[PDB]
């Protein structure tokens, strides 16, 4: 539906760290819908973009793509403005079929979420331990 | 999945440990609760995973379970521990609760 | 953290009042709310439950055609309908918060509020 | 760390379904773990693979890749064995760097998890309508 101010609460390694995302408008060229964070500097702010395939009469496949990327920057010595030193990326691409029902797509999405909360993948991401 | 609990009455005076079980029908994994209520007020949570103490309840309650058979026990019965303990499974959707065993 | 839900309600058979449960102290739109029905002399039932954000509903099979439940985010309240009431409905209805809006492992009811003791 | 059985319960749409994954051995040519559900026929069952780039002396940047697929099959007339009718894929790729601290790596994983349960992606995946 129409994108709104998404607020994510109780996240990050423990307890509570809220994160309020404000919409940043759809890109007409390719249709990605952007979200961002109310940061002091426009280039030091976390952002996420979703992109659902446009429904057509003859489209024998669909593709959802969610792309999070958030930067972390320190105050570089010898300059008055902060500069991005590194950033973390994460993209997920669902790929369904023209005949897939809702029970399948909901299943895949919730399975991915529960796997993200699983005791295996939490350590595989936090501590980078291969399985 | 239907949970069938084990002796409902158990009688027992306040001088001994008491142990009870809450069987599962179709191998629920180690995720079930052990609610306790005293008559007239709302229930309270004691064991929230299978063997984990919930928030601050004194460490005289202890739970443990196999793949499809789980147990709950108390060291000192004390005067307060009464009121038809309950067990609930969280594997499927129904979350059917148990029969309830008074003391 | 506290959930409160009146003390007593009386309808007469045929009518349908909607129970309310107000939660204060834990940022309502983060933990799902569950409803449990206790007969005067029998066990608990787990009518159903929803979470405050994204409004997904989990129902028991028996109560699917009898009760519907919703949220009110502005006042941070949970409502439950009981659209039709017969003689064998007088019970105690507890509202308890348990879980979180993005994990499917912890759903243990820990913070039960008091009852309502419906009478028909 | 060491992979074992992974149990997911109350998974989505209506919370009525469960899923138990059993380890299926680490591939030794490219280090890809594997998990699968005990299905009727090995040719049709839900599979999950987790791949983490191995630690080395320097490395450019690390990579975590999760990849699930659920095949749905039907018993076609004139045949005695089920044939996979279709399947829905999904994959997520994290791209942390060498100096990434543990806290910010654990922030992306649970930001994605808390975002896959927001109304925006529920509507974007379950019904396939853009923003």
């Amino acid at each position: 539906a129409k994108l709104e101010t998404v607020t994510l609460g109780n996240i990050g390694k423990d307890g509570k760290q809220t994160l309020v995302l404000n919409p940043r408008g759809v890109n007409p060229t390719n249709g990605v819908a952007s979200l961002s964070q109310a940061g002091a500097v426009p280039a030091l702010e976390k952002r996420v973009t979703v992109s659902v395939s446009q429904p057509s009469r003859n489209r024998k496949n669909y593709k959802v793509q969610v792309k999070i990327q958030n930067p972390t920057a320190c105050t570089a010595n010898g300059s008055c403005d902060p500069s991005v030193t590194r950033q973390a990326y994460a993209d997920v691409t669902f790929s369904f079929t023209q005949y897939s029902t809702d029970e399948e797509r909901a299943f895949v999405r919730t399975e991915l979420a529960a796997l993200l909360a699983s005791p295996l993948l939490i350590d595989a991401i936090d501590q980078l331990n291969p399985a | 999945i239907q949970m069938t609990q084990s002796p409902a009455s158990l009688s027992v005076s306040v001088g001994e440990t008491v142990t009870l079980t809450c069987r599962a029908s179709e191998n629920i994994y180690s995720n079930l609760a052990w609610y306790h209520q005293k008559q007239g007020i709302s229930p309270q949570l004691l064991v929230y995973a299978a063997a984990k103490l919930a928030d601050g309840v004194p460490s005289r309650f202890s739970g443990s379970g196999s793949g499809t058979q789980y147990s709950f026990k108390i060291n000192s019965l004390q005067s307060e521990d009464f009121g038809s303990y309950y067990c609930q499974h969280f594997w499927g959707t129904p979350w059917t609760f148990g029969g309830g065993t008074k003391l | 953290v506290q959930l409160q839900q009146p003390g007593t309600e009386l309808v007469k058979p045929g009518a349908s009042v909607k129970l309310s449960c107000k939660a204060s102290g834990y940022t309502f739109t983060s933990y799902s709310v569950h409803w449990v029905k206790q007969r005067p002399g029998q066990g608990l039932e787990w009518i159903g439950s929803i979470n405050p954000n994204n409004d997904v509903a989990y129902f028991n099979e028996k109560f699917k055609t009898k009760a519907t439940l919703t949220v009110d985010r502005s006042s941070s309240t949970a409502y439950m309908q009981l659209s039709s009431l017969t003689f064998e409905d007088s019970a105690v209805y507890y509202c308890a918060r348990g879980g979180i809006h993005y994990t499917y492992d912890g759903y243990y009811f820990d913070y039960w509020g008091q009852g309502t003791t419906l009478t028909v």
Side-chain angles (χ1 to χ4, degrees), chain A, chain B, chain C:
Chain A
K2 304 302 141 203
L3 72 166
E4 269 177 303
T5 60
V6 165
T7 72
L8 310 170
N10 300 111
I11 62 170
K13 171 109 192 172
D14 76 313
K16 169 253 184 178
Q17 276 168 50
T18 59
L19 181 137
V20 171
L21 296 159
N22 302 313
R24 244 51 170 191
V26 188
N27 188 358
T29 52
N30 63 7
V32 293
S34 313
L35 278 150
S36 162
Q37 200 197 13
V41 189
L44 277 179
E45 87 188 357
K46 320 168 146 47
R47 40 176 51 109
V48 64
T49 67
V50 307
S51 167
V52 183
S53 179
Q54 213 44 60
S56 179
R57 301 189 295 173
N58 48 79
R59 190 66 179 271
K60 308 179 264 145
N61 63 7
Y62 290 61
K63 194 172 321 283
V64 184
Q65 185 151 11
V66 185
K67 184 168 314 213
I68 300 164
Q69 63 84 30
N70 57 205
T72 43
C74 71
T75 64
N77 288 316
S79 180
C80 64
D81 57 75
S83 194
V84 171
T85 61
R86 61 177 191 276
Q87 40 194 359
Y89 304 121
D91 63 358
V92 59
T93 73
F94 300 93
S95 179
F96 312 112
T97 304
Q98 193 194 30
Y99 283 110
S100 277
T101 64
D102 197 3
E103 321 313 326
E104 305 191 21
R105 314 190 286 248
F107 192 83
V108 174
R109 155 192 91 82
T110 301
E111 175 176 346
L112 184 65
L115 215 51
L116 284 184
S118 174
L120 187 153
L121 184 62
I122 59 169
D123 78 20
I125 297 169
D126 293 28
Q127 281 89 23
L128 273 66
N129 287 339
Chain B
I1 288 183
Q2 313 94 20
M3 308 271 273
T4 61
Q5 200 161 10
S6 183
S9 197
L10 265 180
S11 303
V12 65
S13 310
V14 61
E16 292 179 353
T17 68
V18 65
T19 299
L20 61 83
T21 80
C22 168
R23 297 203 318 103
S25 82
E26 293 179 353
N27 185 2
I28 72 162
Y29 288 71
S30 296
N31 44 8
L32 82 173
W34 278 109
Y35 307 125
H36 172 89
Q37 67 155 338
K38 284 172 311 203
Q39 83 204 0
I41 62 170
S42 53
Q44 209 165 345
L45 177 79
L46 300 192
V47 169
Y48 82 97
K52 293 182 183 293
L53 277 296
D55 198 319
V57 58
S59 166
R60 66 196 154 102
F61 307 91
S62 54
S64 182
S66 177
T68 185
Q69 203 144 10
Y70 304 70
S71 73
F72 182 64
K73 54 163 301 283
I74 313 166
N75 283 358
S76 57
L77 189 152
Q78 188 274 331
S79 190
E80 270 156 310
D81 291 331
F82 300 101
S84 75
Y85 294 60
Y86 296 105
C87 59
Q88 185 184 25
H89 87 83
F90 286 104
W91 192 227
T93 188
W95 306 351
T96 46
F97 276 98
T101 77
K102 314 202 61 203
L103 292 181
Chain C
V1 57
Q2 156 175 346
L3 283 78
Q4 53 204 340
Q5 44 160 330
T8 302
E9 277 177 26
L10 170 48
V11 307
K12 65 162 51 63
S16 64
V17 301
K18 66 184 289 184
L19 310 167
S20 58
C21 175
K22 183 161 153 63
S24 58
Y26 66 96
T27 65
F28 178 56
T29 81
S30 282
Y31 292 163
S32 45
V33 176
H34 312 279
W35 287 84
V36 177
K37 163 206 202 182
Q38 187 183 208
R39 280 278 186 175
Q42 293 82 17
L44 309 156
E45 211 76 31
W46 188 74
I47 296 169
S49 67
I50 59 170
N51 62 5
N53 60 333
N54 81 16
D55 305 357
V56 298
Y58 293 159
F59 273 113
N60 198 317
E61 281 295 349
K62 319 195 284 220
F63 296 120
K64 186 163 311 272
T65 186
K66 186 173 202 44
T68 182
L69 73 165
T70 47
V71 290
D72 183 287
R73 264 151 270 190
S74 63
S75 66
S76 77
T77 311
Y79 302 121
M80 202 265 268
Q81 208 45 45
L82 293 197
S83 295
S84 295
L85 294 189
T86 62
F87 264 120
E88 291 86 320
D89 299 318
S90 180
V92 183
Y93 293 87
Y94 305 106
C95 56
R97 64 91 160 179
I100 208 165
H101 60 280
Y102 68 92
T103 76
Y104 313 88
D105 205 327
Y107 273 132
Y108 316 105
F109 313 155
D110 63 358
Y111 275 8
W112 307 66
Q114 54 274 65
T116 60
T117 78
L118 267 181
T119 58
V120 294

